[PDB]
Design a protein around this nucleic acid. Sequence first.
RNA 1: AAAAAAAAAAAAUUUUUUUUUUU
Lengths: 493, 494, 494, 493
Amino acid sequence: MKRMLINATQQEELRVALVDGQRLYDLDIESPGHEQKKANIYKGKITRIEEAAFVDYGAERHGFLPLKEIAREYFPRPNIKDVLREGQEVIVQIDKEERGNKGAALTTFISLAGSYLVLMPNNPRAGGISRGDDRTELKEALASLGMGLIVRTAGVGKSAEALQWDLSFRLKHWEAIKKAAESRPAPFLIHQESNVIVRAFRDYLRQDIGEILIDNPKVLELARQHIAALGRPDFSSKIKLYTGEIPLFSHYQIESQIESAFQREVRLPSGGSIVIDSTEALTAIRINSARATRGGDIEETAFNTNLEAADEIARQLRLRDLGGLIVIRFIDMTPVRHQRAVENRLREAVRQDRARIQISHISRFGLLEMSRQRLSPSLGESSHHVCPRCSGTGTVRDNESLSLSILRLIEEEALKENTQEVHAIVPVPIASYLLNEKRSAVNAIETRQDGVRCVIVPNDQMETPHYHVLRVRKGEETPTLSYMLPKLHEEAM
Amino acid sequence: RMLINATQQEELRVALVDGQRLYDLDIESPGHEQKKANIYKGKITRIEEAAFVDYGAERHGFLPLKEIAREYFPRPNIKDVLREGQEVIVQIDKEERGNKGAALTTFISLAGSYLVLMPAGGISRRIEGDDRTELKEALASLELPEGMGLIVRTAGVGKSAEALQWDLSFRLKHWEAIKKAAESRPAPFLIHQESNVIVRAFRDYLRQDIGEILIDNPKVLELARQHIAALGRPDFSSKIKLYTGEIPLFSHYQIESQIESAFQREVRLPSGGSIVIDSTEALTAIRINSARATRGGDIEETAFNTNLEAADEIARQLRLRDLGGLIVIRFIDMTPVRHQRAVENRLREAVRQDRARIQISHISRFGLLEMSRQRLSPSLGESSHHVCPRCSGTGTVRDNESLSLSILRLIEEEALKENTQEVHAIVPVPIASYLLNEKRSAVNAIETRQDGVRCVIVPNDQMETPHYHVLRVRKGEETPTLSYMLPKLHEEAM
Amino acid sequence: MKRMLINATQQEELRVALVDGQRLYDLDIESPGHEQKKANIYKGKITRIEPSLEAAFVDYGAERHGFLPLKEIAREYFPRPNIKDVLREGQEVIVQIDKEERGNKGAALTTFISLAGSYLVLMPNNPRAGGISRRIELKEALASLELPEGMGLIVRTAGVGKSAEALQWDLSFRLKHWEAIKKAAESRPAPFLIHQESNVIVRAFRDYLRQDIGEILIDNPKVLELARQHIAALGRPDFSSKIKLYTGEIPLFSHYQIESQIESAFQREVRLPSGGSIVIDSTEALTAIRINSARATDIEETAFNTNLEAADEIARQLRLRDLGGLIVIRFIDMTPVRHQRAVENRLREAVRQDRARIQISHISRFGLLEMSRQRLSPSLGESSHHVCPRCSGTGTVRDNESLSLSILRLIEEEALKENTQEVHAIVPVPIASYLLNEKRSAVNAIETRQDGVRCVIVPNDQMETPHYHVLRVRKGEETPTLSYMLPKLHEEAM
Amino acid sequence: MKRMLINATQQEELRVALVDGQRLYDLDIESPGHEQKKANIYKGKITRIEPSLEAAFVDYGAERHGFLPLKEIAREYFPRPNIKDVLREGQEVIVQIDKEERGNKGAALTTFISLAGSYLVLMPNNPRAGGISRRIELKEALASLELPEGMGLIVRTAGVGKSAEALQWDLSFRLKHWEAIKKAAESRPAPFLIHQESNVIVRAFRDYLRQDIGEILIDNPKVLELARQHIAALGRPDFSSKIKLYTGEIPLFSHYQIESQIESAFQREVRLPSGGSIVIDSTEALTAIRINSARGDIEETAFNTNLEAADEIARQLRLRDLGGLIVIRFIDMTPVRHQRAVENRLREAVRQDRARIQISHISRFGLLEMSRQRLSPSLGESSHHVCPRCSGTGTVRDNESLSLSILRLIEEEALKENTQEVHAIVPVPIASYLLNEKRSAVNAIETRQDGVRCVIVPNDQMETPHYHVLRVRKGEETPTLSYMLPKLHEEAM
RNA sequence: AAAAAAAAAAAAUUUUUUUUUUU
Ligand SMILES: [Zn+2]
Ligand SMILES: [Zn+2]
């Protein structure tokens, strides 16, 4: 049986888990505090125009809107200046939220989701039915109901008159968009990203789930209320309390599976593992073998490990809510039939979450390419931050290589015109290497580039990958002692 | 030109420059550069038409029948040729393929002063005319033993016949002396020369289109002229010249900023785009970024020209970094196919100047191009960096309260165990501050619900956000040790 | 009203206080574990003899010998010039600990056992010692006591108004306790202990109990139970009516407002009603007090009044701290002597209220008053603090350049030695920064003038400003160890 | 031979040492910080008046007040009970700094300037003071001097045997200099500086240089040049024959083996030839010395060790330039005549100082009291700073005893009305002890003083001695995380 | 963290989780 388990015993992160008996199928965790860095909707103004235009919506860095995402409601496709004009105001949704010095990515194609159908108020072309005899007769119902709309899997077999029930809520909710836009305040939006209940059921709750188990009565009562508000008050019969002495997720033994969604590596029943590495623009998965078993059949070892990997990779894609481009390095399979079998097993595992996923065949190099629909940012870089030490490179520069580089950087600052001093402020061991092993070269710099003071400072506040070299121009000289330079710069910077 | 910087002995830097464009580079330090394509002793550890060799590498090396000479037989199975626990002397033919150990060969060869001993025949093609027709007269007198082969080396030109008629005995002794080495030395250990990394740097790079070699250290210049003259090419020594300026050689040609582009994560491009290079456990991903959109840019010219510059730059970085194994490149999306193809063939032509094998796929639907590069030596990422000690190479660290709540639910499951009297968590200061104040209610909840078990949470000065410990105290083996003493114990117990 | 207040709700320190209304009168705080050097009576073995020291060293059960001077041996142990005329090796003696825990050294010992009761002290090994406390019909009551012949006794101030028949009760317990000691001492094997630190009432009442105490208030019922039992065992079950529990939400010591007064016993400086203060500094051998006036705004009347208030508070701190040994005071200078003596007599009157003996000399030529106090137990300074690991108890740290230049010439003076190849200094970050930038010219001057010696200076994370190390490397001891590896070496090697 | 050795090879401290053969005799070390509180003569403005103190406060141009008691005001400033009968605000006086930099409190001043030459000291504002050295032609020569009326003079130790004509040379410079003082004083504005502690060459000799010193050795030629110039202006140009350079590769102080003796002036403890030692501790108002024995005949060893200690204590009193009250535990001696012998050994060792020194007898408790004149701040005041860790107490409170005191301070704050939270910011081991060993009591406080939160924060930036406990009033609560509270309070307060 | 054994709990009574055990 499929079951949904909700853990809310500690309010600082609400955990919702979808389970197949004892196997965790899907996960969402949202916290109050920090900043909840996903999927917000905003009201904003066009501020600069060029394959995109830039929107001021009250964020500290502007949003980015490309030509693909410009709705017809802007119009008066070579240049955006032929489509847009300054000071024009629209509601937009963030895909990627204010990362670094790049703007937050936007769309104007907001969509409103119901119990049976999703409404596309800005796009009359977009419509369809989620992936036979059911689809086609539902498409006749859909066709009978500037808007477009899509019908959810929970709409399977619903009549053209039941769908007319749910659509009345959706069109009220479009009136709520129009109230938000010209009735309500300048930064305002419709019912927000912060809702605990609606988004949690509506994205993933489907009828073959047998029970919802909840550990907090005060949350369970609001769940009853919202599932009744979502039009399913009969389905409230499935909501049940939990009371057991082991906490709910350790009671069903999904606790380690949940934390596997944060792990870099997941091990597999045959003893192989999948390793997930995220890069600038793609997520790379590498699959690792178990022991060779003293001349076992390496084809079935690879093929079975790849299959158990495909079963796990589709699941991690769900659990992490990954999006954008992915690359998979499966173990090398000689015959084509093994390659096909892994490709189609992956397809059959990933289609059962509703998010659009697209897959290539295995290349000559053994690399498979796939993509996943951009529904929200992953757990990575929403419950994580960029590593302050290595700046997110994942590597530290080797101590002698850095020391010798700083030595020649000092030399190249001291070569400059108008130069009176150079200060290198460095980690303690870097200073130790410079001022003993390379002291002969620091003296060589001070004597060749004659007249420049060279100061090398060991800093308490630095560790290997961070250093500063600074130059002092004529008349900027100071009596400040060498050990006082970091104390100055903690205030000065 | 070829520019050699060695004014600092702690790393030897060799650069190849075209005009003032650095086009190829090598930087490795002594003391942890490995000279040869090394020869090692190893143990036959698993067998099937190959055997697997423990030569001290982290994953065993591969010894196929392709590279086993019949003199190593005691032909369907190596199980019938070799046995478990057998000790073999073998050479690295290919160095650390991807995840795997080295591929290995038994065809060891020893280089003498006229010849290379194959304990096969011919002469160096590089010697000509009246040289070959005297060198053949020096060869024909040599007393090489039965069943051994030879190659007459380029170094053989001008060497006198009556010294080297004896000198061939050293290589014939050295083939037996390998036995002495193999039973005196430990197994994962080195063997004599054939691998001077400064002279052999010419073997990697020096061919006739190079006009000059400029060397800023006079002793390295002395050793270079000595080697190129000893290799029998004293005419070619006319290319080797000193540098003497007070600005260092690489700043004199203004390549010093270009060299460190081989170490940066990101290199910016003349059109204002950039390439970003990331390494994963088995492949390298490159992303190409446009310039910030400004003042009426043209969308196809921006994408296409930035990609073409990025293709030239990527081929250049591939050389500079000495990357190897699989690569994936995400170019900027180009609408018309001929622009895509033109970028592919620009990359192909740029990389064909490399002497390494490089192979390239077509651009996929997603805008991803796949390629390979030959596994010639460790990259700059392997020689000059190590994995981040904080994050262990993720490049991102969990948010403090999120990691705290993960540690809290681990503590809760440790307290649920049988045979348990206390649970100790040792954590970074902010984790303890959060758990022992914000989540104090939960710590009390664990201590009261999982009845009878003590919970200790210790703030440690010695920890950063990624690392923590949670531990078990057995019933009756409990200790009176104070909370702040537990890290002082565990830094020295384990 | 005088009260005794006990706070025992937190076991990691038991607090016993005497209060005069809301004014704290006397205090002890001791932490748990009855670690036993108090007044211990032992059977011990004579293990070394030193007539040069005039002492014997006794193995009484401790891991380090106890010290028994010739001053402290009763004639019963003789076979007064030499220990060799008075004791011999392997002799067994009965002894009592007089002095607690000098340094690393064992306890000092006497053979003149004394047992102190509620009203009297019994001197069973000394017939000459006897009297009545000078703080006091009691001489007639004493003369009526049936004291055993050859013993002495002294009567306490607690004998005030007591009857000749109540005094015989205390005498009956104390002499029974000595008869038990004798039965134990001659039945039991030599290396053993006869009575010990651990009794709560013997510590509590004998240090504090007088009849004018109106109440004893206790906030822990397990203690109150044992208090009523012990005061009944003392034979005052009627006095158990004074023992009462405290139950308020404000803790006992904050209800009587003494909790702020207790912390004055820990401070270096204590403020006074006239706005002056007293500052207490303890040195190698004496405790010196300074008295300060208030801020400026008649200074002569202020000086005299502040000295008097300081004398009352100094006598009170001498109690609360349980100070012992020599004490020295700077009062504010008073012109007429009769005001100096008036302050001395205020001090005398404030210290007569201590039952520990105190002795005073007159105010000196330089305005120093010298006095001593009986070493009944280690003070709060000796028992509840440890020496500063940074300043080593000076209260001062050397200036960074003042230290750096001294290290600089220490490095030079090591480099001057013959047979020398390297010198290493390991020093704090700022000291290394000063040595290697400000004084780099001098470091180079040493390397060139004291030619042939390598000079290494290492900034250490694990050293503060006060400490440093400087070391010398002899001929051929040279090592490839990196500079920043030298501390890592010495933390593991030493 | 007695020698003066000057070491100047390193400019950051100039070292002047005086040696009796190879025994270090006297020392001064000064760093080139040209801070002039030292001893200079000034003109100042009467700025505050205190008949309560019988004193006045003077503006002499410093940011720190001068203190000028009626003890120190000459009758030339009057219009002896009250300063209001002597002074008014804005009156201008000639003054000299007597006391340097007590605490925050002002430098003490005198108007009774005295000018000290090479053979004599002139007392131009004081007729009463004059005579001949206690520690020593001269009876004729003194009477022959043409000393101006109303001035006094004192003959120096260096005046031994000096002629009736040499003394008239030195007198002429002193009476020149008093005119220069008055000319400056009545020409120039109100607060200003008249004359200088140009000590390094000239007065470094003149306060120190006696005819019995055989050589002056100098390692810096620029200093040697300035020495030979000044010794001629001092009127001893024949003595310029004695100024010599030192040139060896071993530095001057290590050649004469005094370098190891000098550091004894910085140490807490100094060793003695009999294997004993002396321990010097300085307190709020006095310096206490203790003498310790070696592990001989105990009565004879005590007496000999006390004598060797007296020799060294007199020498340390000079080398440290100690000042104020001194107290000594000598080892207790049975016969009294050994007590006076040590007392008078100490007297004879200190009578060699020109600083005023006074000694009492060994007291009842075996304590000897003495005093020494405050000629300048010691090496303890000039070349050390108060320990930052212990606040100069010399002890650290035990972690549990401090923890339990903080615990009950937290409880006593949480008892207060108008109180919403209590925050304690503490060192790591104190928080560790409070929140684990004493967690039951923290919970006890949170339950008894119900409604008030207790937060205990482990701080990176606090050592064992320091702590803060703070009170949060109604509505002052914050969502700021516990680990963020130190960052908040470092910026706010 | 590897073989066998015994206990507790969860989904369908056998793979899963924990703990412990090996002259
Ligand atoms: Zn990192
Ligand atoms: Zn200190």
